[PDB]
Scaffold this active site. Structure first.
Site, PDB file in Angstrom:
ATOM      1  N   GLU A 357      -9.220  12.362 -15.951  1.00 14.50           N
ATOM      2  CA  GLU A 357      -9.799  11.062 -15.623  1.00 14.50           C
ATOM      3  C   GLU A 357      -9.561  10.692 -14.163  1.00 14.50           C
ATOM      4  OE1 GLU A 357     -11.524   9.138 -18.230  1.00 14.50           O
ATOM      5  OE2 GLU A 357     -11.413  11.200 -18.970  1.00 14.50           O
ATOM      6  N   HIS A 487     -26.292  15.104 -29.782  1.00 14.82           N
ATOM      7  CA  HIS A 487     -27.140  15.224 -28.604  1.00 14.82           C
ATOM      8  C   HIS A 487     -28.593  15.541 -28.934  1.00 14.82           C
ATOM      9  CE1 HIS A 487     -22.990  15.947 -27.364  1.00 14.82           C
ATOM     10  NE2 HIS A 487     -23.329  15.548 -26.151  1.00 14.82           N
TER      11      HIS A 487
END
Ligand SMILES: *[C@@H]1O[C@H](CO)[C@@H](O)[C@H](O)[C@H]1NC(C)=O
Ligand SMILES: *[C@@H]1O[C@H](CO)[C@@H](O)[C@H](O)[C@H]1NC(C)=O
Ligand SMILES: *[C@@H]1O[C@H](CO)[C@@H](O)[C@H](O)[C@H]1NC(C)=O
Ligand SMILES: *[C@@H]1O[C@H](CO)[C@@H](O)[C@H](O)[C@H]1NC(C)=O
Ligand SMILES: *[C@@H]1O[C@H](CO)[C@@H](O)[C@H](O)[C@H]1NC(C)=O
Ligand SMILES: *[C@@H]1O[C@H](CO)[C@@H](O)[C@H](O)[C@H]1NC(C)=O
Ligand SMILES: [Zn+2]
Lengths: 596, 99
Positions: A357, A487
């Site tokens: 991150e 997806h």
């Protein structure tokens, strides 16, 4: 009095309006994400509606300037981003139908549950039911039951919707002066203009085919080793030369093979590296983990976190008083606001997620000086690759020994390296064929080479020829297997992961070579190497203002996708597999099926 | 707080403009906003949680000078104590001496 000046003024106005509108929307979204409350939802809805209305209004006025009369190669990209008719080319009723069909598909996927036979009062929803079973069960009939069920209940409620989805999306794509919707997605890699760096939309298919033609031997050896090892856990369910069943891959769809480590470990006697006990014994907290990550990032010469990041970004779960969504995410609210939203625990997995991150945040902070429309990555694959290179580099035993989290007398042997390499391979190498095959099937469906009545006849046919997996039960045209994925049911691209995986190892090889590293690639740490950071910076600050080929060439030295670094990273594992499976057979035949 | 964005000229040292007439960008004559005819005034969006580079700075550009004038109101002068019955060097309002 010309067209270029008018376009420049128009972009100048848009740049200042969009900043304020986007900042309001992002702040509302963050405020909603912190809590769970009705008024926060109301504010988020209002802000999103206002932003969408402003964007739609500004899109219409941008078509007055012809694209052929402007020769600047910088404002042209922004105008091309703005001049795009989104979904307004069709009539209003068709657009309403498309929005309804997308919402129906999303709702059907989100709230799907399956009930055990003869027990209507016991129904599970995958997260702690099917997928949990999928990930932590050694039984055979239960896995097959869940795998067949989930698809049986979900895909048949999505296929008729998907047919109309495809038809309408093709209509819109042809109305937008394209070939099909697959061409519409392939256009993200399209580069036109400056000579020497052109990239046509059709070059991507050839590049992917050529690059995948070289990975086959390593995947073949890994597949053979996995098949040989799994014959000990399922003695009477795996063919000696056949393909691996898809319901025994440790996942619902087979995207990753990570959950098979406990079955295929080379040396089970020697333990792996886990510094959780060292973390606990020294009274470590989330703040310490984050400051260690910041120290690692500054060790290579990059800047460190703004003061506001230490104030506005939550680091630990508030508790029962509030109710947040624990999911790591790097937030770039704009106007100098960068935040991290993650519930942190004392564990090595969080120790690596923090690095991922923070790499995200660093990449976002790199290109803050570019105009608003160009504040993104070079393509849809650079971002996670830049995130993941740090995670790969920060887990080396040398770094752990240097920071004091491991015993200095721990003699690293040449036997644990094989374990680490196999664990990395099972999650990196084993996902490329799946992504490649899914994208190839989707492109073939959109193009029109596959008629409506020959979809599944190809879908299971490609698997046997590429991934080496075979369906356990036969399927007819009523099923829609790919739509079971997140997806596919929701409108999302899938070629991002292949490019990201190929880019990350190339970047790692380039940085390790620039860091004067001696030895195997898997023992490389970019720490204490300024030359390994500055080079990366040359790509970080470009953003979308330059073609991705030039950005890739600025670091690696080549302007095309390459696969040699990936195979170089796994060389000792490749040698060990070659030595181990000398008495077995490599390759698979597409004739054996479990049901016939 | 507002700031100018568009103008069909450059500025000169120590010039101030308050004009609010719409800015022309095309050949056609203009009456009101709509097409290439933008308003040359845009406001800021200051918030307390902005980054260091976007937070508002109160900037006193002391572009001060204009020294010369019949009058010269002055900066402030330091004074010391007074000594008597002794030989000292004195400065009283510009009259300088010894005694
Ligand atoms: C979050 O919720 C708490 C109580 O539920 C409230 O006091 C606080 O103001 C809320 N904050 C935001 C940003 O919504
Ligand atoms: C294109 O425009 C940008 C500003 O929008 C400018 O910096 C650049 O020099 C221009 N390109 C050329 C070749 O002049
Ligand atoms: C689509 O774009 C063309 C210009 O390329 C424009 O003439 C047309 O009106 C647009 N259709 C819309 C906005 O629905
Ligand atoms: C790294 O963080 C420390 C801690 O505040 C700071 O003193 C230092 O300036 C940072 N390094 C850079 C390059 O900004
Ligand atoms: C980086 O250099 C510092 C300073 O010499 C040292 O303390 C640290 O252990 C080094 N880190 C690694 C991973 O070698
Ligand atoms: C490790 O080194 C030893 C050296 O004695 C060698 O016998 C062995 O084959 C090497 N590889 C493994 C996996 O142990
Ligand atoms: Zn990520």
């Amino acid at each position: 009095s010309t067209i270029e000046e008018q376009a420049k003024t128009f972009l100048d106005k848009f740049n200042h309006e969009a900043e304020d509108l986007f900042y309001q929307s992002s702040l509302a979204s963050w405020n909603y994400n912190t809590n769970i409350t009705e008024e926060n939802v109301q504010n988020m809805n209002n802000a999103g509606d206002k932003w969408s209305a402003f964007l739609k209004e500004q899109s219409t006025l941008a078509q007055m300037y012809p694209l052929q009369e402007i020769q600047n190669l910088t404002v042209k990209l922004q105008l091309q981003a703005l001049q795009q008719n989104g979904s307004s080319v069709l009539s209003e009723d068709k657009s309403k139908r498309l929005n309804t069909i997308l919402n129906t598909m999303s709702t059907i996927y989100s709230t799907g549950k399956v009930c055990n036979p003869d027990n209507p009062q016991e129904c599970l929803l995958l997260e702690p039911g099917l997928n949990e079973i999928m990930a932590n069960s050694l039984d055979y009939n239960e896995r097959l039951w869940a795998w067949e069920s989930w698809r049986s209940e979900v895909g048949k409620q999505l296929r008729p919707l998907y047919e109309e989805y495809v038809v309408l999306k093709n209509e819109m794509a042809r109305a937008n002066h394209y070939e099909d919707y697959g061409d519409y997605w392939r256009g993200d890699y399209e580069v036109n203009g400056v000579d020497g760096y052109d990239y046509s939309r059709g070059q991507l298919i050839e590049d992917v085919e050529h690059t995948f033609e070289e990975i086959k031997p390593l995947y073949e050896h890994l597949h053979a080793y996995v098949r040989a090892k799994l014959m000990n856990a399922y003695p009477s369910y795996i063919s000696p030369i056949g393909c691996l069943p898809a319901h025994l891959l440790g996942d619902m769809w087979g995207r990753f093979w990570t959950n098979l480590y406990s079955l295929t470990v080379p040396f089970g006697q020697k333990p792996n590296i886990d510094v959780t006990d060292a973390m606990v014994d020294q009274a470590w907290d989330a703040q310490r983990i984050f400051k260690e990550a910041e120290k690692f990032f500054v060790s290579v010469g990059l800047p460190n976190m703004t003061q506001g990041f230490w104030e506005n970004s939550m680091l630990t779960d508030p508790g029962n008083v509030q109710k947040a969504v624990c999911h790591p995410t790097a937030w770039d609210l704009g106007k100098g606001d960068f935040r991290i939203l993650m519930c942190t625990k004392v564990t090595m997995d969080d120790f690596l997620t923090a690095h991922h991150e923070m790499g995200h945040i660093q990449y976002d902070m790199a290109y803050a000086a570019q105009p608003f429309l160009l504040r993104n990555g070079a393509n849809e694959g650079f971002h996670e690759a830049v995130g993941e290179i740090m995670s790969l580099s920060a887990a080396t035993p040398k770094h752990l020994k240097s920071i004091g989290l491991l015993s200095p007398d721990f003699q690293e042997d040449n036997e644990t390296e094989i374990n680490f390499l196999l664990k990395q391979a099972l999650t990196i190498v084993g996902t490329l064929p799946f992504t490649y095959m899914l994208e190839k099937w989707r492109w073939m469906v959109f193009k029109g080479e596959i008629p409506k009545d020959q979809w599944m006849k190809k879908w299971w046919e490609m698997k046997r020829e590429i991934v080496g997996v075979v369906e356990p039960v036969p399927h007819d045209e009523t099923y829609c297997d790919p739509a079971s994925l997140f997806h596919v049911s929701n409108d999302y691209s899938f070629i991002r992961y292949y490019t990201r995986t190929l880019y990350q190892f190339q970047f790692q090889e380039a940085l390790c070579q620039a860091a004067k590293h001696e030895g195997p690639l898997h023992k490389c740490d970019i720490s204490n190497s300024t030359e390994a950071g500055q080079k990366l910076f040359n790509m970080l600050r470009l953003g979308k203002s330059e073609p991705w080929t030039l950005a890739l060439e600025n670091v690696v030295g080549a302007k095309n996708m390459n696969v040699r670094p990936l195979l170089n990273y796994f060389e000792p594992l490749f040698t060990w597999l070659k030595d181990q499976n000398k008495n077995s057979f490599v390759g698979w035949s597409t004739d054996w099926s479990p049901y016939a | 707080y507002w700031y100018r964005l568009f103008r069909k000229s450059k500025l000169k040292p120590f010039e101030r403009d308050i004009s609010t007439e719409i800015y022309q960008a095309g050949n056609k004559p203009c009456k009101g906003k709509g097409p290439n005819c933008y308003f040359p005034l845009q406001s800021y969006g200051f918030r307390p949680t902005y980054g260091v580079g976007h937070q508002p700075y109160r900037v006193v550009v002391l572009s001060f000078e204009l020294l010369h004038a019949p009058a010269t109101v002055c900066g402030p002068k330091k004074s010391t104590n007074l000594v008597k019955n002794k030989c000292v060097n004195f400065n009283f309002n510009g009259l300088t001496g010894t005694g």
